[model samples]
Target chain A: SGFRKMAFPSGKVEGCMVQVTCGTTTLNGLWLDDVVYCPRHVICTSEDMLNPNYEDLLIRKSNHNFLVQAGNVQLRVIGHSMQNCVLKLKVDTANPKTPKYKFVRIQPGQTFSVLACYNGSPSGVYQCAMRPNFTIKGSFLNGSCGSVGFNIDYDCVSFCYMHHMELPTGVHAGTDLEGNFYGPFVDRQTAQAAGTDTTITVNVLAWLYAAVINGDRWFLNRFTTTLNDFNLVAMKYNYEPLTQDHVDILGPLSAQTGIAVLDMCASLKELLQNGMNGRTILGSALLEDEFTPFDVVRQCSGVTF
Target chain B: SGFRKMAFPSGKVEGCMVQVTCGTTTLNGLWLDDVVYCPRHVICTSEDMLNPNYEDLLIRKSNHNFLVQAGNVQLRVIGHSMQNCVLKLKVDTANPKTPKYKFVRIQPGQTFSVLACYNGSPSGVYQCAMRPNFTIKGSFLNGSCGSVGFNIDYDCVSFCYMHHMELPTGVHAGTDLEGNFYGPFVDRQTAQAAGTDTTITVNVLAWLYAAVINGDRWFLNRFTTTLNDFNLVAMKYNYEPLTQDHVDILGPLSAQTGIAVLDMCASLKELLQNGMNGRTILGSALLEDEFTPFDVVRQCSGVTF
Candidate 1:
């Protein structure tokens, strides 16, 4: 009703930035970018950007309930004490009269993939009847197999955009320990004493994976569009266009178009020495793994990332 | 809670049907099909269905602020006395160093076209800074150009589908007048007396248009998939496949695919006479302009549309 400044956080960095020179520790007698990047850039990770609360954010909104992506199809569990139980997902072709089910067992604390049977064409709807059957302790859970159906056509552009690939709830982002910002530290005191910095180093693959997982089309469109623009500038500078490389980094995202998991211990060795073309129009890295493109722009402009 | 019979309305037909002899009125001199169909069926036209409470729906929403669609781009008003002022829209290509602005004049209450200057690929972002100035009555109104930016790529399928064409608010469905179920009626009492039946005829084009406007992908997907199935049956009955005719009805819906508009008035006349080989799997028209496909299904199954 009246003029007032909103209480939203302003003048804050959206992504992690490496601000200080901190003594590095080699875990297992090896200097890994994934390991070093984690401790140096504490505040800005895919986890931090996507969920502000990070580790404190509830893994599942409800108990014994989980919705996971099974390739193009979604496998949703509906039962009591779901985390304690294993789910049996039955995928069936939606035939009104008699839908013959094909069963796939999804174990607890595990992530798996299932390919859509009928691909390349928009044909029958995929009807998945999911049931929480057995528990990890060899106990049988009581619940009816409730069915959910959706069109399984990957060729549909809108469908592809809407159902972009996302990692499951507990997927790791470079570090092994859950929500350990300083790699192995329990709090800010010890981490600082052990030579961790106030800034964060952005991770490109992890940042993109979180972007898709968060399902923000506005952010996705901006990032993809920015990447396209980045490629145009690359050609003029006689650099290899990074669009294809960017897509390849994220694994299979959209069936038509375009995450996190750092398998590049040897590959990143030399790449880091070049220190990222990182010359943004605003003076930040375009492929910063810790922050979104918007955050990069904001941080580069000193308005905060 | 105890079960009881509900006081819901019953005995309604789902799709349009040309029923028994009812006195038809020729509005001016010619026997217009729009008029004949109105008294006979009651609901299908935009005027009849879309705006149930159009005027009352407004009045409280706001005063002197309207954001209307001008072809592909959005024409937004920024001030209270907007009707008295002409708007100046400045389109800027998203370049941080030097953003070049192109001014475009948009008159009050006029719909105009603005094609994306960049196309075929998602490249530069379009930032529109809008301001209201130069009042029509030579009155001065103060306002600055508030900006809104977005990636402008018309070739993007996901973008187009998400931002499909929509009828502007207060845009008449068929007739300009308010709550005219049969063009000249106050309530159902007068409509029924004038031979307006309890049923609604499906308007394929009008229904699809409304579906897109409402952004109901569930309804759109259901209708489109149903239309595909309908075409399969058409071949079995030696009937003209409805797919081509369906696409033609919707004036440029998608570059890829597939209506309530009249030009199909002749096609419908013969189709209705042949009594619609319309054996619906669940017994309802796939593309009904008069009612939502969901409502049509419910009514066909006697659950009320």
Candidate 2:
């Protein structure tokens, strides 16, 4: 499937570009391939086309900014590696408008991860994109953050791109028949199984924007209605300007999940735009008052450390 | 004490003229000052305003047209000496672009009785106003229609708009703590009490442009919230858009207590013009289904024939 490279409508974002690299699988199916999406429809599917599983692809984006309160952060890509690729994490403090973001490169089946922690940075919602490296060559990408939360260490591990696990890899599940995505339901006990003390669950709500109700969690309910469902039915409902920060948090020690975090923030933004005052309430509950900054430690091979 | 002249903010009739008549008793010191709301504001308020009691003041606008389907249609004034007032039932027919509706001569306090029956004349929600004949001033005029199940002799007992009725009008009671208006709740029992065999119970609902949750039944909730000590707050949270038929009846019925029905309809229309599709649903509901055609009837002075 061909992914359309388009611009944000109304020029909300100028000069921002997407760089995508996929694993073996492609993204082409119902609700994922619409022509009028973005400025013209960017297919999230794979090049081989014929219907590819997103899981089979090792995707990564770069050139995005990561704004944190403190200085230590890391980017991680999850999955098994079919192509042992080494990933680098960099922050470009040069351009204020286009500050660098957390990016990673991963071989098929292997995972890449990013860890960001700060002690003093303005706490608010931030936007970022993903860029691919020389070996990566899939132009269309849509980066995202998901379910913002901090662990006991007080270190903010904000945006978790995918519903992948924080620890004990492969702990998260994809969307169910009901359009519900469940992730890291691991509590303290499950955390032990994951070999980690910090783990937060996705609590799988309804899919962000799918027309069909009757089977979704929000179908026919206050949270979701025919009008609302219709409004979001537009292809790019999951796009940016679709999310916000309903509250604040400080974190560093726990793992992060991307799209889920973006979705949560987007929900908060929706509620705010809709004039609902309960957002702070939601945010406060999601992000606690206590948070710790991250102290980075890098293992050097040739540096003789 | 000033019954401010108002203008609807949105809709086809947005910016249309409005007249505010105070309640029977001097119930001041509350947030009861009257003002002409622009049609768009009215429409916006109809959908966005969360204030409980003030919601009944708006009417649902559809497509851009005012008034749709209705039931329990009735008209009455709230101010003093309402009897002998000449109320006019207006309709916009000449220019659909800016249709100017103005009916004539309804004696105040006498309740424009001719419109009380289900004659099917004033179909859809109506733009009702009053100008009491030379004698009594300031009173009520017209409204809607639905399920009282036909069969009532015309010209039998000269129609009369009777004032003063007991409570529990079902779903919608006419009076409010702030002395605001509401009405036309299932006239099943009212028709029954009038010695009519029709047993249709209609639920009265309005479409005002003040709050976000506009299309729901605002009047009924008003009664339950302000009058009874029940926790109507919970009910307020459980909002659902009423059918067009319900709003057609409720909007005008709401004005029977002396709010400007036409102005309210206009405000609702403004909402539709905006991206407020929920309001559009209601506005469409009322017009989608047409009741009886328009006609005028007047007989010679009755001689008990």
Candidate 3:
């Protein structure tokens, strides 16, 4: 399999130096300090690669003076500026000039919150600038709410990524990162399953992005058509989104079926972006009251829970 | 263009023997001589082609004991059967056994009416069978109410056919069955159109049955999609049902643009039979509120006139 590695050496950053591999094709790259760049194709990114008018908006380091709190797919900014100041919060900036931002007049003690995005509650990298100085501050990750209902990890960029990044132990039947727990016994020899735990963990997102997000019509048609079948499986297993409040509701079912739940939500985000709305009615019904995890389950049954 | 014709050797029954033609292919056949039959699919016969076991429910030669009045899209059976009779009226029969039939008990001198079909209010062949005798009596043509509102011809199988079956003189801009109005003027000019003061008077029910009654998916898709575009043209010209009341509505528009109208409505009938319902909503809106012919026009502009 081909491997791609990105190396960042100015300062040590967790998960900065990473590698992605697939079939005989290899992509390797390095990120050095302070370099202006240009490009053709780019996935969701904070810095614009095609346009030269706007400067890079990457946040290289964190700002400790300001505290950020995430909740229910929203980001809240608390002003701890040593001096009272006005600041502009730029979110998900593919270009510095066109980033989604809100300028707030905050005293040293005020806080403000903004709803992240429509369709799916995904997190994005954010940076702020003090208006008078106009100097862009370092980076800060936002949109992860620690509440049990919509909880997502700090580094997770999407709702699905946050929930399925790690699978809970003893919650599922298959072999996970914990090696084979079923057996290696001589008397009762066990056969290995067809899939490796690594494929399930690593390649599913890549496939979803390539096939669905990229507007692959064939895959989209197959994905949308099979949603009815997926609904049937969700009911059979009673799979519910993992939450602190509903930990006992499905017990180990969440961990057993969490991957499917994540995939379903991710598929929905892709569907909405693609202007597919017949199924949108189904998704809209789920979000009618408010985004409750149980709503997704009700949609699977074609009814309101 | 193919052509198809069906011949009746039994007798020269009005509206019974029919012919249809298109680019070179042809399908011609015969409807047989009578046997004592009553009831359905007989289109108002003893022969059941799709299924057996259910004997011929044909309407034999005329039984003047009863009078049948045809309304816009319905049948009114006035039972003057000096003796009380129990009769069943089967309509829109795609098959022999389970047709859309209504059984009515009429006194020595009573009447009963049946609404033919929905959406298009088009007429279909219907027949009645007197109970216990199991004999099929002749079918009196019904469902052509001459009142102006839904005033299709007493025998109009579709709305367009009722309107365009005959065009009024001097109303349209182009050549119709009447002598050409706009030609034979110049050397480089085209000749006036050549069509007699005649119409395609075939029953047309057979074609609808062949295409849609069979539940063919591909034909069903094409039939449903064209319906939306048809609605647009119907509105452009105030094409009303062929009736005395709406004589002032579309006038020459029918003669000029009626062929498309007839084809569109026939296609709709096929679609309704095939269980295509998405755009059925759009078609149905036009028919609703008393089959107001002009309601279809308002749908194009998204307003209620």
Candidate 3 lDDT for residue B35: 14
B121-238 per-residue lDDT for model 3 (tens digits): 2221211111111111111111121100011111221110010101111111211111111221111112223232211111121222222222222422233334345445334433
Q: Name the top DockQ candidate.
A: 1
Error of 1 at A12 (Å): 36
The residue-by-residue lDDT of candidate 1 on B134-161, one tens digit each, is: 1111100011001111111121111100
- What local lDDT does model 3 show for residue B57? 23
TM-score of 3: 0.16
Total clashing residue pairs per candidate?
A: 20, 116, 33
For every candidate, how close is chain A to the native chain A in TM-score? 0.17, 0.18, 0.16
Query: What are the per-residue Cα lDDT tens digits for candidate 2 across A1-305?
Result: 00001111100011111222233221111110110001001122434233433224324322232121112332222211111111112322221223122222221111112111112111111111211110111111112111111111111122112211222231222211122222323211133232222211111121111101111122122242332342353223332121122112211111121223334434533533453232222112121111111111010011110
Query: How do the residues A48-108 of candidate 1 rate in per-residue lDDT, one tens digit apiece?
Result: 4343442332233342232222223432323212111111222222212221222223221
* Residue-level lDDT for A288 in candidate 3: 19
* Per-candidate DockQ vs. reference: 0.01, 0.01, 0.01
Lowest-sum lDDT 10-residue window in model 1 chain A: A136-145
